[PDB]
Amino acid sequence: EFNILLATDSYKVTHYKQYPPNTSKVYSYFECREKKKYEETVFYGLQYILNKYLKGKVVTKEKIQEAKDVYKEHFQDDVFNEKGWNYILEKYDGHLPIEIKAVPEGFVIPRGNVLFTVENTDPECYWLTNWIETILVQSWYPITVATNSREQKKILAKYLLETSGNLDGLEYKLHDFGYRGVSSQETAGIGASAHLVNFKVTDTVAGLALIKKYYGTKDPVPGYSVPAAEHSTITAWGKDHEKDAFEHIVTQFSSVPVSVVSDSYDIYNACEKIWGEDLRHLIVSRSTQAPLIIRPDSGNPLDTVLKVLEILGKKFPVTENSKGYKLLPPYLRVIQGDGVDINTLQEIVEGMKQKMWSIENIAFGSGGGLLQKLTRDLLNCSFKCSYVVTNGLGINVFKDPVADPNKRSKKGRLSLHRTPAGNFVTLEEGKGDLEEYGQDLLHTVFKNGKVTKSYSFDEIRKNAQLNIELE
Amino acid sequence: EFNILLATDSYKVTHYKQYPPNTSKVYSYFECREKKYEETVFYGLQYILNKYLKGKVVTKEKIQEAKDVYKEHFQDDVFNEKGWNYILEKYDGHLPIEIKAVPEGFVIPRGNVLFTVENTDPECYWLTNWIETILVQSWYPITVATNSREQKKILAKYLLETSGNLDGLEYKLHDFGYRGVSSQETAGIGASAHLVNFKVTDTVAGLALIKKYYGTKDPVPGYSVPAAEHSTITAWGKDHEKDAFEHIVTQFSSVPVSVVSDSYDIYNACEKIWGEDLRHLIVSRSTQAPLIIRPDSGNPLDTVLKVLEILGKKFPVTENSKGYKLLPPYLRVIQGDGVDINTLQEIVEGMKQKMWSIENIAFGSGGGLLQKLTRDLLNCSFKCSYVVTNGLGINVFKDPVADPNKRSKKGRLSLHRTPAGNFVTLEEGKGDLEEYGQDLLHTVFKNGKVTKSYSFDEIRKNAQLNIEL
C-alpha cells in the first residue's frame, strides 16, 4: 500500500529542523517558469494526484512506524518528525491540513504564471507544505504531455485548414502509440489521458480507465482505436507470403477501417505491386467508412511519406480538391507512425504541402515522442516557497541566483487574474487583495483532506480547445 | 486493480484474427538492437514477472470488464472472450507462457538475445505477443541501469587517475530524480535501477521496490544525508542567509550535511559566509561529518571550478599523492544542477585539467538520470522470430529495405559463450547443433510461476565494472 510518509525526496525528512524557529505558515506555488517555444501550457493532471494520493486518511500508526524504521536505516540516524506526523493522525484523523488552490483543469495559461498554490492550515504543520512538493511537482508530466500534444494539434490544424478548407477529422490525426515506450504502467495511463485532452485516438488503453475513475465523460469512452496489423501478424506468414497476409487481414476486417504495416520487407513494392496491383480489387471496393490505411514504419519519415503518396497516386484514382491539393480516394489513407515528434510532424506536413498533397490523406502515430521524450525542463515546471509567517509577521521570500536570472522566483502571496485586454497576469506580494484586477482565477481544490472542486473530462477538453477550433 | 486484459496496445486485441490459420506457436525475443552504449545491463524483468504476470491474472470479472471497454473503444465486438475464458477455465487463470532470460545484472553487448517468450498451449498462440507491451517496458530499468553504469565508468576513471583509488565511488552519483519523473511507479523502478550501480538516493520509492521484489542482506540498498533546499534557506529572509546556514549546520553538527548555497550569490556565500563568517563552524567538524556545499545554478563546469578556487583560498588545501589538490576532510562539494552523462564527463575532465581531485566532489542528477531516456537509446525491441503453422516450424523476421538496422533475428534463439569468452547469439535453432556449448538463458517464468530469481546483491555483483573486479 502507498505511504505518503515515504513519498517525498529523502532530504525533506530533515527540513522540519531547518526552517526559522517560530514559523507558523509556509506558502508555496507552482509555475511553468518563463525562459529568456511553448508559450502557453495546458493545466491538467492535479485532480488525479489529489484523489489518488492526497485525500482522506493518509496517515496511520502503522505508516508512521514503517517510515520511522526505513529512515533510521536510510540516514543511519534518527532524524524523522514522528511527533509532527502523530499530531496529524491524532488531531485530524490522518487527513492533511493543507489547502491547495488551482486554476481550472484544461485552462491554457501563458508561461510564468501561478498555476497552483499550497499552504498549511494549522501552524503546527508549517513543514507539511513542502513535504508534498515531490508528489505535486509530478504534475509536470500530464501538463507537459497535454501541452506538447496540443502544440502538435495546432500544427495539424493549420496545415489541414490550408490544404482542405476545414478541420474535419482533426481529433483523429495524432494517434498515441506510446504504451510500450513509456517507463511504467502508471505513466502510460497518466500520459495517455493527457493526450486525450486534445485528440480522440489511442492504443494506450490504460488512459481510458484513469479518465473514467478520476475525471469522467458523458460518452462511454474518451478514446478510440481501429484494427491494425503489427509486423508479427505479417511476418508470421513467411517471407514469400506477404500478399497472403495482407489479403487475409483486409478480408477479416472488410467493413471497419484497418491499418496494415507495409514495410516488413519492401514498403515501395508493397504499395506499388501488392496493394497497387495484386490486391487492388480488394481496396477499391471498400466503404468510405472502412478505408485501408497503409502504414510505412521505416526510412526517413518525410522522404518515405512522399514516395508512398507518389506511388499510390499513380495506382489509384486521385482527385484535386477545391484548394488545389491532391486527394487519395476515400477508401485509401496513410498513417506515418515511425519517428514522429513535434519537429518531424512539422517537417512532414510542410513537405506534403510543398508537393501539393492534402493533409486529409494522412494521420500520424507517435509513441516515445508523445509520451516519453519530455522532461520537467521543457516548460520549467517548478515549485517554490514565496511566503512565510514567522513570529506572527508575514515575509515575502524568494530565490534569485546571481548567475541565472531565469531561476528567480516570485515573492509573497500570489493570485491569477484576467487583464483588461483579456490576457493573464500573476500578482505578487498579496497585491490581489487590492482588488484592482477582478476575481482570482485560482479556486480551492483541496482543503484538510477533502477534494473541494472537481472537473469532468468534458470540461477540461472544452477549456483546452484551440482558438482555430473556437473560430 | 490491475487487469492484464487491459494492459496491451489496443491493436493487439485484434491480432488473434490475423495470424495464419492453424498457428500453434508464436515465439518472440527481446534485444537491445545494434546500430556509445556498446553493452547493456539487463535489469528489471523480475519486477514485471512478479507484479503483473504471475499467478491468477484472469478472472470472470476481468474478462467482462475488458469485453465492455473494447466494445466501446473499437465501436465493435472484436475482443477474444473465448480465448481468455479458455485460460481461466483450463489453467485457473495462470498464463501458459514460458520466458527464458539472461541473469539480472548481466552486462551484455548490444544485439544479443536477452529474453525469449513462447506459448506452452497451442490454443494460446495469440498470447505471446499480447504481453509484448508489458514486457517491453523492461527497456526503462535496463536503460537507467545502463546509463547509470556508464556514468560510474567515467567517475571511476577520473577518481582513479586523480586519487589513486576508488574509495567512495558508489557515493559519487546521487539520484535526485523523484520530482522529475513521470509517476510514482516510474520513480521506484528508476531509482532501483540506479542502485544497481550506486548507494545514494533521495528517491525513497526505490527502497521498497527492492525490498519487495529482489532483497538485500543489508537493511536498505541506498542511503541519504540531511540537506537543505532553497525554501529552508530563503524562508529566513534575504538578509539572513548566514543565520540559516548557521542554524542548519548546528542542527546537523555531527552527521554530513549538504547546504544549497546559490539562493542569492553562490560566490559570496562561499567566500564570505562559509569562508569567513562561519568558517569556525566548518573547520571544527568531523571527517565523518563534512559540510557539503551545493551550487545549483550557472554553467556547471565554470561554477564548480570557481567554487573550488574560492574554497581553496579560504581553507587549508593539501596535495594528495597523485599531485592533485584536496580540500580538508570536513569540506566537500556536490554539483546537483544540469548533470547528465555528457556534462558529468565535462566537469571531471575540467577538474582534472585544473589539478583538482575528484575526491572533492559528488554529483546529483535527476531528470538526466531517470527521465531523459527513451526506448531508442539502446534500441530495445521485441519481435517474433519463429512460428509453427500446420505443424511446420518457420523462421520469420522483418528486414525493411530502407533501414537494415531494423532487421530482426530468425528462428529459435540461444545465447552462448564464444571460445574467447564473449557472448554470441545463435539463430535458426543452431544452438541445438551443440557446437557452442550450453544456452546461457535460463527459464524464469513458466505457466504462471516464476521459476528463477535473483537477489539485489547478486545483481550488483553481476553489474560490477571491470576496474572494480
Author numbering:
A (entry chain A): 8 to 43, 53 to 487
B (entry chain B): 8 to 42, 53 to 486
Which of the paper's sentences describe this entry?
The addition of a Cβ atom in G217A occludes the water molecule and disrupts the hydrogen bond network. The conformational changes induced by G217A are amplified in the G217V mutant, where the H191 side chain is twisted 40° away from the optimal herringbone conformation. The RD line harboring the G217V mutation also had the D93 deletion. The D93del/G217V RD line is 500 to 4000 fold resistant suggesting that a significant increase in resistance is conferred by the G217V mutation.
NAMPT functions as a homo-dimeric enzyme that catalyzes the rate limiting step in the primary salvage pathway for NAD synthesis, the transfer of a phosphoribosyl residue from 5-phosphoribosyl-1-pyrophosphate (PRPP) to nicotinamide (NAM) to produce nicotinamide mononucleotide (NMN). These structures consistently display a NAMPT homo-dimer with two essentially identical active sites at the dimer interface. Typical NAMPT inhibitors were found to occupy the portion of active site responsible for NAM binding and a tunnel-shaped cavity extending from the NAM binding site. Furthermore, we determine the crystal structures of six NAMPT mutants in the apo form and in complex with various inhibitors and present a definitive model to explain the differential effects of the mutations on various structural classes of NAMPT inhibitors.
